[PDB]
Amino acid sequence: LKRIDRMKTEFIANISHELRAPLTAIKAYAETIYNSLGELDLSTLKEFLEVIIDQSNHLENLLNELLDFSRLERKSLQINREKVDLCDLVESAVNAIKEFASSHNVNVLFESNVPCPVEAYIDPTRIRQVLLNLLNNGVKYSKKDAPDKYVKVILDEKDGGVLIIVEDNGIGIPDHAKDRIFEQFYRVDSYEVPGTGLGLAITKEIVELHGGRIWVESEVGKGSRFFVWIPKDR
Amino acid sequence: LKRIDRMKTEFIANISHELRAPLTAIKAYAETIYNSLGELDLSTLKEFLEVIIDQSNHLENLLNELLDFSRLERKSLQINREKVDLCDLVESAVNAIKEFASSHNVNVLFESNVPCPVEAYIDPTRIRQVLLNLLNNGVKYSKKDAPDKYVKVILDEKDGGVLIIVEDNGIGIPDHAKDRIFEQFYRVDSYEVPGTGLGLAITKEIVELHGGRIWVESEVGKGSRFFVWIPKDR
Amino acid sequence: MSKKVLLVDDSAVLRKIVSFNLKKEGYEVIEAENGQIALEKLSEFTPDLIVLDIMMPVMDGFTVLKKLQEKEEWKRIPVIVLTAKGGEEDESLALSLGARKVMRKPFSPSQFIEEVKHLLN
Amino acid sequence: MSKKVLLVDDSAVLRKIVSFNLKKEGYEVIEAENGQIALEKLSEFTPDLIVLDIMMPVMDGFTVLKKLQEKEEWKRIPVIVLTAKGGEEDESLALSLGARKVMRKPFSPSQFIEEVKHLLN
Ligand SMILES: Nc1ncnc2c1ncn2[C@@H]1O[C@H](COP(=O)(O)OP(=O)(O)NP(=O)(O)O)[C@@H](O)[C@H]1O
Ligand SMILES: Nc1ncnc2c1ncn2[C@@H]1O[C@H](COP(=O)(O)OP(=O)(O)NP(=O)(O)O)[C@@H](O)[C@H]1O
Ligand SMILES: [Mg+2]
Ligand SMILES: [Mg+2]
């Protein structure tokens, strides 16, 4: 009854898939700058260098997912709560991924049905990772052929706790897989998309360690919406 | 019963250790060049670029190890034989490691007891991987810092097949661990040494697919000697 | 007149680093984001060498190779396959589909350029 | 009247890029391949800021930290821990051993120099 070992070996090939693309860029751009120093103006030199730095951050995301995976098996993943302004924290996360979404054309909007500030007793680092994870998934799995592509977070306070929503016009999760998207290693198989299946598993562990829950409401083709409920725990 | 799942997760953490060091170097060097373009002389610029290309090749070895691990599971690894002079093959492997050996202060040798050429119906690509693996291990787990560190390759033909010996002044393999180093993921955890564990596992698969076998003779402190026997063919 | 090559890949990051090194030797680069667009740009002209990725949205590289060696004007066009799929059978399939060389990612820019100059003779 | 920094790590590949970015700001660099050599250099002078790696041969970074808060001539030296360890156990441990700040590997050089200057003022 231990078919989890069968799923871990597929996680290996997924790591090699996530490692194969940025390594191709780092190796090619580095040897290019080396053997073509005289054929580089200062703009293309900085551009190639910045491409090298961008791919290392992709691999840095891959390294941090392997460490947080080690902390889900250890069950040692801990949260360190601060008194953080929520609309301030979600603005710092929306600001960061705004440039990445521009490379794939996606408007990252932010609305707040409650007045900023929205203070809470949460860990700003892990919640920001939750925001950057849900926003990275909203832009990546967003439809390609479509005009005015967007992804919008909504700050709200329902049932005492704080309810955050992440809406997008993405491809939508089918009604048969919407249950297992939070389980580890699970991914909606449908081409050359890099992924490991741990994004929502760590997102689920971070939110549930904060004392709340996270679920998803999506339609096939229309869009996707993720919900995160967390108490203030003053 | 099924501790293979336990030894797989430790290998997952080993992938993160193998990824953390070159990524720190690629991130640091590529970002220094970007911010210090007005302070980098051309010697240091090419030197920093050279470091980036070197660390990218360290990660490329990591990518190809995960791909070969995916071939040991599927049992899909095949060899493509062609009549290759073995002397030109080993001399092509001791020089592809001679620079990496001089960095860690150690030289390579080639004492062939049979005059060249030595033609054999083998796969030169996979056998070069066998040689580079035994040489890289002959310089990685070498002596602590003792004088006269070397790694020797002895070409011979005994018992109807070609017999190669890889000698070194390494730390020596303990007699309690000499019967499991070829098992996957195994590594004598006797600190700052990167280790995947399946280096000799792929080496064993390549040799046994060529028809022959491979064993190890080692004494603690005296050094290590790996024996590879592959028959000649038509 | 300068040489012309057709660059086919879904990764714009790869198309830039290959267009640079291809233009470094004096060639003219024509990009195509997938296999279907590559066939469309194959109607405006006929290149002298094609660099083809395999895993691409819409139309994959194996389908481009099959469409190539069946239409005469495209039969003799040498095609290098620059694919991340370094599988055992993937190389033999693309080679059977008419490819002159199959290179794997990550790749060396100097090695790839020297192979392009080989097929252009 | 420039500041001098004691850089401690077992990888010359790291010490190279850190000694470069430290000398960029007009600092002096004194290297040490392990923790025992770092203490041997600590008898010759007294650094303004110490950069300390954890995973090292001979003498790791934890023992160096304990011997820093011991000898009351070094107890007031600001120490930056540049380690590959990331678990909350390792960070809080080095913090209790007298370290001022712990940064994980990989690290941003601009943020590292910013913290080096924040501790030197
Ligand atoms: N915004 C979205 N719209 C549509 N489908 C989604 C969205 N977010 C996630 N999914 C699907 O749900 C699954 C979520 O898997 P996840 O746990 O995020 O692993 P992952 O995709 O590898 N994340 P990462 O490693 O950060 O790229 C994916 O297979 C997607 O197909
Ligand atoms: N030349 C050598 N001298 C002494 N010990 C060795 C030598 N080669 C291998 N070993 C031992 O073999 C064990 C595992 O080797 P191996 O199976 O190749 O994994 P690895 O070398 O750690 N992986 P990688 O280096 O990434 O290929 C280590 O614990 C070493 O102690
Ligand atoms: Mg592709
Ligand atoms: Mg170290």
Numbering used by the authors:
A (entry chain A), B (entry chain C): 244 to 433, 437 to 480
C (entry chain B), D (entry chain D): 1 to 121
List sentences from the manuscript.
The bifunctional histidine kinases of bacterial two-component systems possess both phosphoryl transfer activity (kinase) and phosphoryl removal activity (phosphatase) toward their cognate response regulators. After sensing the environmental stimuli, the histidine kinase autophosphorylates a conserved histidine residue in the DHp domain (e.g., H260 of HK853) by its catalytic CA domain, which then transfers the phosphoryl group to an aspartate residue of the receiver domain of its cognate response regulator (RR) (e.g., D53 of RR468). Here we report a molecular mechanism that gates the phosphatase activity of the bifunctional histidine kinase HK853, a member of the HisKA family, from Thermotoga maritima. In summary, our combined solution NMR and crystallographic studies have revealed a pH-gated conformational switch that modulates the phosphatase activity of the largest family of bifunctional histidine kinases.
Beside H260, T264 is another conserved residue that is critical for the transmitter phosphatase activity of HK853. −-RR468 solution, the fluorine signal (F2) interacting with K105 of RR468 was unchanged; however, the other two fluorine signals interacting with T83 and Mg2+ of RR468 were perturbed and were in good agreement with the fluorine signals of the inactive Fci state of the HK853-RR468 complex (spectrum E). These observations suggest that the T264A HK853 mutant still formed a complex with the response regulator RR468, but the critical chemical entity participating in the RR468 K105-fluorine (F2) interaction was absent in the T264A mutant of the HK853-RR468 complex. The overall backbone rmsd between the two structures is 0.32 Å, confirming that the T264A mutation did not affect the binding interface or the stability of the protein complex. –-RR468 substrate is shown in green and the T264A HK853cp in pale purple, with the sidechains of H260 and A264 of T264A HK853cp in the stick model.
